[PDB]
Amino acid sequence: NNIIKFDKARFTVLTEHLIRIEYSETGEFEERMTQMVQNREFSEVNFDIIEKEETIEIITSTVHLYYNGGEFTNASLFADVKFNFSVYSNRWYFGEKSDGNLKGTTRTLDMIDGECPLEDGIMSKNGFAVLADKGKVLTEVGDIAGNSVSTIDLYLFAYGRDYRQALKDFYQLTGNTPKLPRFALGNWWSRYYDYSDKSYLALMDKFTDKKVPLSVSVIDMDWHKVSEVPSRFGSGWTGYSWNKKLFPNPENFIDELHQRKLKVTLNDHPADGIRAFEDPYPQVAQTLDLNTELEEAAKFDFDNLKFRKAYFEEVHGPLEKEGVDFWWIDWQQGAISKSGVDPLWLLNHYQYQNAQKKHKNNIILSRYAGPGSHRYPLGFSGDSVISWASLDFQPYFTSTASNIGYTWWSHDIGGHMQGYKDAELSLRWLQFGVFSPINRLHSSKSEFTSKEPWHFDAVIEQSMIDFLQLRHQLIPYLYSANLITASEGRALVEPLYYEYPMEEEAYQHRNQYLFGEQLMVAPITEKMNSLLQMGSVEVWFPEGTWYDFFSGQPYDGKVSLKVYREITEMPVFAKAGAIIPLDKNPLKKEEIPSEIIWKIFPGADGEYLLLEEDNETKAEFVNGIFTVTSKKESSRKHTIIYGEHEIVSAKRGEFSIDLNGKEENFDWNFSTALFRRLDIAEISYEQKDEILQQLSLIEEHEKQVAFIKTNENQELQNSLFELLYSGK
């Protein structure tokens, strides 16, 4: 039906915009799943064929795919897309690169200071991409079966700029992202530091005292033997044996974390395997029949069924019995294997499967293992260099990853290692982290790189605590988005061009992104101007009325406008009619919120669906009427904030309320904001006085702008312009 053969090729028209292309020397084509591809079942589509003696052409709504017979070459296999996004980059040639690809992601940010190259994704400004399937075939139950009989196997995506549908159909082909568990979406604490049981528990209790919520307790490699390992074994990098001086009763320690409602993960460095000094070695040496008198190591070999079984049952098994919830797979030792399968892919695939025996919807934490490895969340980007350049790369890196379906990157918030101390960098990084897929604080082995908020001065500490509480207020919104990724193939973090594919400005704001469906984020990733005592970012406001999510400062779209914020504030925006649910009790240890705040932005209708473990709740705003209903009844108490004011507090059940009488306006006003920006600025008092007096006295908006245009401080002009623009 949707399968055509010609010469030694097979073409499957999976959708009008997706064509599998195979070559076979043997006349046998591959039906089995691959490391990448999990499903080729798609509903029948319409297309046309022009088949001649020596040529075939397959025509869809969006592509002409041509094959002239013989071996696949740039001349024998090519395609024209039925778009005009470019004058002459509308042709795919087999084995050739074309321009327009919007990129995807890469294995890691290990040792990266700022930007690094990315792999291609499936999204292109010019409307097509090819995704080579170079992976091994799988058995029915998901084991490596060997080499595909399709010796060339490609997917041609020709979705134009319908990026969302491209990603949806990629997830249909490669398997949806599984559901995260709610616990993964809260704050994680991590540090490469030789904590004892006592010192780690004291820190967790200090987080509680300081009003910082946490969901995960990471224990880095100093949980296991390091310096005690005799040198004949090699290093202490790999370990499976508790340091009993630091953790004299591991099961008790983990029970203590469990009693604090924390999930626990240990660092695993797998590459040196199970050597003869290890606590599990006698059991593993028995199972794998090793020579114990010659201290024969169980060398790491994830190609080997018996090794994997010993690793899961006899090495992880006892640690999981002590209470370890999930595994931080920390692989930095290369891509070499006899099978030709990346050991990182084998670890992620097999550990993610094994993790589901411990807990429902369990996770791992591991580096990116290529297309399809979004099936094994979470992503771990690794050893970023602590720099402004690294932070400036990170928003772009994160949204761009959605172009290959890898939507759960966990970055070391505040960066991993080396680089330079700057409290303002640490605070900006946490701001981004809170509005990123996962908020995991982590640092390398320095005495000087703790991400503890109280490491910093009173201003930085308070702002960090505020943002860390905000992350937990956002867990309902994150969890709902998580269920949407798993069920409908929509990323939490989208580049602007997913929503605005035809706006040139949607390609010109690398670090700006949609965060779920209700929020638009423009993180500040550059050090402040000391003259203004504010940092800035150029923001593109799409057509419509926008508000600062925090302040209610208004912006009339469509405009590109430099926006300025103190180091303690982040640019996050919501449209007229936006509805955002918040946990009213972020510090309370509840499996699901007892109380939701409904934050409503006035000036249009809107709608929000809060998806939960065992409910759906619909919030509707239609002609000033706010209505909450749910699929199931519950004791939940709902609070409504309309623009500035709390309207209803702690109201139970379903309900409908008229907000047409109430104040739609936010307090945010030009005069107050002007005074604040002049007051903090490190500029002459004569300039502050003159600006305040003139902008108060001059009434016409165009003459207020003419007054600021004469200011010799170009950045002060831009800061004052933002206020006048918001105040027009």
Residues 332-391 that bind ligand XYL (CB under 6 A): 382-383
Whether the Cβ atoms of residue 80 and residue 64 lie closer than 8 Å to each other: yes
Q: Which is nearer to a second copy, 36 or 681 (CB)?
A: 681
d(CA 453, CA 212): 9
* Residue 609 host element (H or E): strand 606-612
Q: Choose the one of a second copy, ligand XYL, none that binds residue 590, judging by a C-beta under 5 to 8 angstroms depending on kind.
A: none
Shortest Å, Cβ 9 to a second copy: 16
Determine contact, residues 219/201, Cβ cutoff 8 Å.
no
272 touching ligand XYL, by CB under 6 A: no
Output the CA torsion 427→430→435→441 (10° steps): 180
CB of 174 to ligand XYL, least distance (A): 26
Q: Could you give the C-alpha distances from 503 to 29, 34, 122, 509, 519, in angstroms and in order?
A: 42, 37, 20, 11, 18
Site pattern 392..421 for ligand XYL (x: CB under 6 A): ------------------------x-----
CA distance 638 to 635: 10
Binding to ligand XYL (CB under 6 A) within 178-197 occurs at 192
**Angstrom distance (rounded) from CA 35 to CA 142:** 9
Least separation in angstroms between CB 222 and ligand XYL: 8
DSSP 3-state of 80:
strand
30, 169, 268, 330: which one contacts ligand XYL (CB under 6 A)?
330
The option from a second copy, ligand XYL, none interacting with 14 (CB < 5 to 8 A, set by class) reads: none
Answer whether 685's CB lies under 8 Å from 566's CB. no
Return the exposure string of 16-28: e unless at least 16 CB atoms fall within 10 Å of the residue's CB, then b. ebbbbbbbbeeee
Q: How many CA atoms lie within 13 A of 554 on its CB side?
A: 20
Q: Would you say 78 or 192 has its CB closer to ligand XYL?
A: 192
Q: What CA–CA distance (Å, rounded) separates 290 from 440?
A: 39
The interface partner of residue 66, options being a second copy, ligand XYL, none and the CB cut-off 5 to 8 Å by kind, is a second copy
Cα-based distances in Å from 100 to 17, 161, 321: 17, 11, 51
Distance CA 375, CA 24 (A): 28
What does 221 bind: ligand XYL, a second copy, none (CB cut-off 5 to 8 Å by kind)?
Answer: ligand XYL
We find the least distance from the C-beta atom of residue 218 to ligand XYL, in angstroms, to be: 9
Query: Facing residues of 534 across strands?
Result: 529
Asked if residue 409 lies in contact with residue 386, where contact means CB atoms within 8 angstroms, the answer is no
Least distance in angstroms from the C-beta of 169 to a second copy: 25
Count, residues near ligand XYL per rule CB under 6 A: 10
What DSSP state is assigned to residue 15?
Answer: E
Closest CA to 559 of 340, 722, 375, 365: 722
Interaction between residue 320 and ligand XYL (CB under 6 A): no
Nearest to ligand XYL of 449, 469 (CB atom): 449
702 half-sphere exposure, CB direction, 13 A CA radius: 0
5 contact choice in a second copy, ligand XYL, none (CB below 5 to 8 Å, kind-dependent) = none
Kindly tell me which of 119 and 538 has the beta carbon lying closer to a second copy. Answer: 538
SS (H, E, C) 316-342: HHHHHHCCCCEEEECCCCCCCCCCCCC
Q: Pick what 538 binds: ligand XYL, a second copy, none; C-beta below 5 to 8 Å, kind-dependent.
A: a second copy
3-state SS of 535-560? Answer: EEEEEEECCCEEEECCCCCEEECCEE
- The nearer residue to ligand XYL, 189 or 621, going by C-beta atoms, is 189
Which CB sits closer to a second copy, 336 or 502? 336
CB of 688 to ligand XYL, least distance (A): 18
Task: Provide, rounded to whole angstroms, the least separation between the CB of residue 651 and a second copy.
Answer: 36
Shortest gap between Cβ of 391 and ligand XYL (angstroms)? 17
Residue 96, binding choice from a second copy, ligand XYL, none, Cβ under 5 to 8 Å by partner class:
a second copy
In the set 197, 220, 320, 583, which binds ligand XYL (CB under 6 A)? 220
Place of tokens 């008198």: 293
Give the rounded distance of the alpha carbon of 93 from its chain centre. Answer: 33
382 binds, among a second copy, ligand XYL, none (CB under 5 to 8 A by kind): ligand XYL
Q: Please say which residue, 612 or 722, places its beta carbon nearer to a second copy.
A: 722
In the complex, what is the shortest distance from the CB of residue 220 to ligand XYL, in angstroms, rounded to a whole number?
5
Residue 518 interaction partner, one of a second copy, ligand XYL, none, beta carbon < 5-8 Å per kind: none
d(Cα 541, Cα 557) in Å, to the nearest integer? 5
Site for ligand XYL in 652-711 (CB under 6 A): none
Question: Binding partner of residue 330 among a second copy, ligand XYL, none, CB under 5 to 8 Å per kind?
Answer: ligand XYL
Torsion over CA: 705, 706, 708, 712 (sign) = positive
* One-letter-per-residue 3-state SS of 114-183: CCCCCCCCCCECCCCEEEECCCCEECCCCCEEECCCCCEEEEEECCCCCHHHHHHHHHHHHCCCCCCCHH
Q: Which is nearer to a second copy, 305 or 680 (CB)?
A: 680
Q: Which of 105, 106, 265, 267 binds ligand XYL (CB under 6 A)?
A: 267
Q: How far is the CB of 725 from a second copy (least distance, A)?
A: 6
CB closer to ligand XYL out of 60 and 105: 105
The footprint of ligand XYL on residues 444-483 (CB under 6 A) is 444
Instruction: Identify which of residues 66 and 621 has a Cβ nearer to a second copy in the complex.
Output: 66
Burial of 346 (0-12, 13-18, 19+ CB in 10 A): buried
d(CA 411, CA 393): 12
- Nearest residue (CB) to ligand XYL, 429 versus 515: 429
From ligand XYL, a second copy, none, interface partner of 589 (C-beta below 5 to 8 A by class): none
Q: What is the DSSP string of 342-392?
A: -HHHHHHHHHHHHHHHHSTT---BB---STTGGGS--EE----BSSHHHHH
By beta-carbon proximity to ligand XYL, the closer residue of 382 and 577 is: 382
* Identity of the residue, 333 or 630, whose beta carbon is nearer to a second copy in the bound complex: 333
Residue whose C-alpha is closest to residue 122's, from 405, 508, 368: 405
Closest distance between ligand XYL and the C-beta of residue 366, in Å? 10
Q: Is 126 or 444 the residue whose CB approaches ligand XYL more closely?
A: 444
Q: Which two tokens stand for residue 402?
A: 């959605």
Asked if 169 is part of the footprint of ligand XYL (rule: CB under 6 A), the reply reads no
The residue among 373 and 518 lying less far from ligand XYL, judged by its C-beta, is: 373
How far apart are CB 321 and ligand XYL at their closest, in Å?
23
160 binds ligand XYL (CB under 6 A): no
Q: Which residues contact ligand XYL by CB under 6 A? A: 192, 220-221, 267, 330, 382-383, 416, 442, 444
